[model samples]
Target: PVSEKQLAEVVANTITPLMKAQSVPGMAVAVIYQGKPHYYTFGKADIAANKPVTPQTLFELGGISKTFTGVLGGDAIARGEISLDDAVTRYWPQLTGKQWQGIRMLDLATYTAGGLPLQVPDEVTDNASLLRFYQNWQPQWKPGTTRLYANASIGLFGALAVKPSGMPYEQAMTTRVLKPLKLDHTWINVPKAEEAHYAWGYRDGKAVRVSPGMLDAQAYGVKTNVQDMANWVMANMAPENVADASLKQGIALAQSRYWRIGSMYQGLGWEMLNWPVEANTVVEGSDSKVALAPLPVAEVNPPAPPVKASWVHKTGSTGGFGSYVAFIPEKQIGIVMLANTSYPNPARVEAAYHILEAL
Candidate 1:
């Protein structure tokens, strides 16, 4: 444990180097420890506009949006709106009695859907095409055989999860997940009033934002400021603090580890390690090779519920933005990183580790 001065220094030491090393334009970090919140910012939100990063500046969260998907999906599961055993035919009538054999909805949510690809292919740009893509798809392995991290898998899972409710994905996520968490500023499609506070993501010397695509809202469409995200980490660390009973269950279900793929523990929306985690383990677990390729998975029998004594985190990136969140429930501590540019994951991992160690 450290004092405010020490904590600020530790954060500066951890982040300033990372920003310089990665050429990040603007970044915001929030630390929630001992039930108090601390925030810090670096660089500019826009190099051209000369805007500075504020705690209010919103950044795209990319695939980490899946964490929100997981929590909302868990709510759906808890409310009997969806089931782990649900089949594709249950929601999409077109997939009825097709070759959708050996696949379970759980497999899709957990990245065990016979090796789905990372992104929805360019040719399949609409929901009807996505359905056709799934119908004509060939699984690299039978479902539940391997874990292949892919937006297609989770996006499809999320799309189908909310189909029964008749609310579009964005409406479903906003009402069920973000609203419950009091994430009033977080959104899949940012409102026009909030546009002025949203940051422009940067890559290859150009400013950018996520181009809306099929399942983009489910896969990587979340945009939020640091405070809201840090509060989410706080909620995960202590779900009882949440006011909604359903939201509390949703958080726990999402935090439950349903699979173990080697050293990495797979929760609905998180990847975790045994507490007192090593930096290298965090980095390796999230490496592109692991994320982009299929890896064997073992079901966690009876699905272990959420536990505090673990290093839990998720990383997300878009064409431009990059973001990360990590927390140790045992210590009542967590960190959030939101940036306007997509930087390497390892750097974020290492920087976070150093800061946590310093604490």
Candidate 2:
């Protein structure tokens, strides 16, 4: 276990400077080293109100929440409720024709469904339009040939995961991932009682909370505090320690490598890195060009199983908040960085590397 002084020294050496360099208004961080958890908060939660970030401060998860979507997909797969090879049309009959036939469940989960857009279609102002857009959708690349990060891909998978769910996506995710992980403070919508714990996100120095868009609940809708997010990381490091049977199997499946693009491996929800990794390699792998564009991929035929000692990570952002989570299961070490500003992924990756290296 790391001492408070030791933890503070790592924070001072890495986090404080990143805040200064990025103009970040606030950050709530959690570090798990040698199986122990540590939490820290810095700067202001609301710049204008001058509110401070506390252990309870909730920040939007942006894309990191997609990993939760992955786990749900994993859970269903584990329970034999679904299969990776299942065609999307099986669940949503409207997409049954040739145009959508080849888009399997795996394609949607991995963002490889023939170049799904980064966001849902710009015109997708509602569920109605979202359906209209995909119903008439076209492919930019053959499924499994390329990787392009997209909410459209996972959002559809999210909808498909819940079977329309206790009839709402939010409630389904809560029951499936959050509750099983014992992440009580996390939510698709922060309850009214916890509103006081919500941090204001700063974009261009303007304070704001995440505004929902179509499929937002499934794609990037979680708002959670660092403590819960830290435990989420710890759960990934040792799924059995924090999950029920299917939940444990689901977490394990979500981390398996199905495809490789650049230096990153595409898993259900996480971007994986093989072990003995360097900081530069991770930074380059997560570069927007590699992550956002339709980069070709090498299929891990039969797919590569999760490695116990490897590195897995994901970075997320919205108009206001930026978040990062990464862990090494073999080392039993992980870090979570959440801030109320849309800082770059490279900075987050670098800052985390500095601290984990020191630890």
Candidate 3:
């Protein structure tokens, strides 16, 4: 294991350059190594206020929120609230039709629900319209045949996840996911009392924050601190580290891989590749256009069980901020990075790989 001094120097030499190149105002990082979390911070969370980023500073999680939903979905399944193979029409009868016939809850959770778009269409403004959007939407390919990274897919799954709990998604998540895991600093909406910890994100010179869009809470509405996320990484790596038995089950379920699409393996919300993954490999895996398109199912290699080998990771972004999270369960090592300015996907992957190598 590297000393804290060595890790700090490596981060300075590797990530500092990217911070300047990308014009990132601030960055907060957490590394879980040998089951302990070490944190590093740099730059300013608010340039005008001259506040430095800290473990407590909350940043928009963007699509990483999908993984949170994935955990919630898994928890619901474990409690016998939902089943992966259950048809969507089981929850919403209005969805009954030819297009919806074969689609299962698993398809939406896995992003293999055929041909949904990346974002909700402009016409889908409210629950009624969103339902109509789904009612009218048609799949371009057979269910489970293609992996399209669509907010529509997981957003709809989020709705189904909270159904049996008989609570709003946020409430259900609070009780079943966050509270159980003891994650007080993670939220779909930052409470007014804790607003001081929220980081103001910037793209160009304009301030940007999470907006209430369609499926906002479901797809990408999480706001979390580096400290809380480090705990999350620790839990993913060693779920038994969490004291709560049910939460432990939920974490394991979320981290478990369910499908393979070419070189990429689909977990509940996390994506997986064999460990010792190179930067280019992650770059290719992260490419939506190439990664989402259909790959021959017969040619796809199944994921090794987590007890064997896997590098589980996810990337998230909003207009202003970008985030990356990755963990190697076998090594008990993981990294989480949150930055105020958007950076290239490869940079995040490369930096993460560099840190993991050092560990």
Candidate 4:
């Protein structure tokens, strides 16, 4: 067994070189073992300000926000607020035509909503145009037949997940997901008060932040810190550590397997690989061609009569930030890595994998 000291030493050595090579302005990491959380931070939250990264220093979560949205969808389903089989036309009446008929909520949740692109067109600036765009759109393939990963599909799923709760998507997420898990520092939009903790992301020495595009807020708008993200990792990896029954059940559902594409399995928003999966397998599975193309689809086995899982993970990034998270459920171990650059380095995945493998 590795002592906490040794774990820290190894993690530092693993991350230090990558920070130097990538010019990462700031990064935060959290590791959980036996239900306890440990944290580490490196580089500068603001290079010019000389501020160092800390547990409270916030970084953009990017597409990891999709995981949160998935949890929210699961919570909505648990409360009978939405069904995976529900249609996109159910929430937005404007999408009442035949073209939208075959698209189900499951298709949206699983990124199989007929080849929706990774983003909305530039003209879709507001709700009016956004709805019009969806109304006029046609699927390139049948709803469940193709596996294309796109923000529009899951973003629409996020929007509809909260529609019946009589609350805004942000509020519903806070009440149902964040508050329940006690992830107080997580936010869809970083508010003014917490702005001080927000880390500035950089790309080539230029500071950048996430833009609230048509589906951007729902798709890539989360910002959080090591402490809060540690809490999230705990919730997903060791549900017994979570106290609330209803919240625990919702989280389990969020992490449940919903679909499979090739060797990678899809939980509500997280990705799963049966362990001991090689680092290269995960890296290749996350490759753009696999992530973006329509691949073979696998039927989801029910998670009930729960079986122990070997590995579960997800990776995310935006123009100026990158993040990766993975866990070994049987070992009750997990890792969360956040960086202030959009490039998703395969090294980050391998670093975390090695640390867990050592144990």
Models 1 onward score TM values of 0.97, 0.96, 0.95, 0.95
Query: Which runs in model 1 stand beyond 4 Å of their true positions?
Result: none
What is candidate 1's local distance difference test score? Answer: 0.85
- Which scores higher on TM-score, 1 or 4? 1
Q: Candidate 4, which segments miss by more than 4 Å at Cα?
A: 301-307
Off by over 4 Å in 2: 1-4, 164-167
Q: Of models 1 and 3, which has the larger TM-score?
A: 1
Q: How many residue pairs clash (N, CA or C atoms closer than 3 angstroms) in each of the candidate models, in the order given?
A: 0, 0, 0, 2
Flag clash pairs in model 4.
321-341, 321-342
TM-score of 2: 0.96
lDDT digits (tens) for residues 173-292 of candidate 1 = 878877888889998888899998899999988999999778888889999999898888888888888887777888888888888887888887877888877788888877777766
Q: Please give the lDDT score at residue 32 for candidate 1.
A: 84
Kindly list the per-residue Cα lDDT of model 2 for residues 1-359, writing each as its tens digit: 55768877797678888999999989998889877788888988877678899889999999999899898878888777788889898878877457787789999989888988888756678666766888777888888898888998998998887773444777777787888778999988888999988988888878888887888877888889999999899888888685478888888888998998877888988888877689999888677766687888899989888887688899999889999998988878899999999898888988888788775
For candidate 2, list the clashing residue pairs, or say none.
none
* Top TM-score hit: 1
lDDT of 1 at 107: 83
What do the candidate models score in CA lDDT, each in turn?
Answer: 0.85, 0.85, 0.82, 0.81
In Å, residue 265's CA in model 3 sits off its true spot by: 0.3
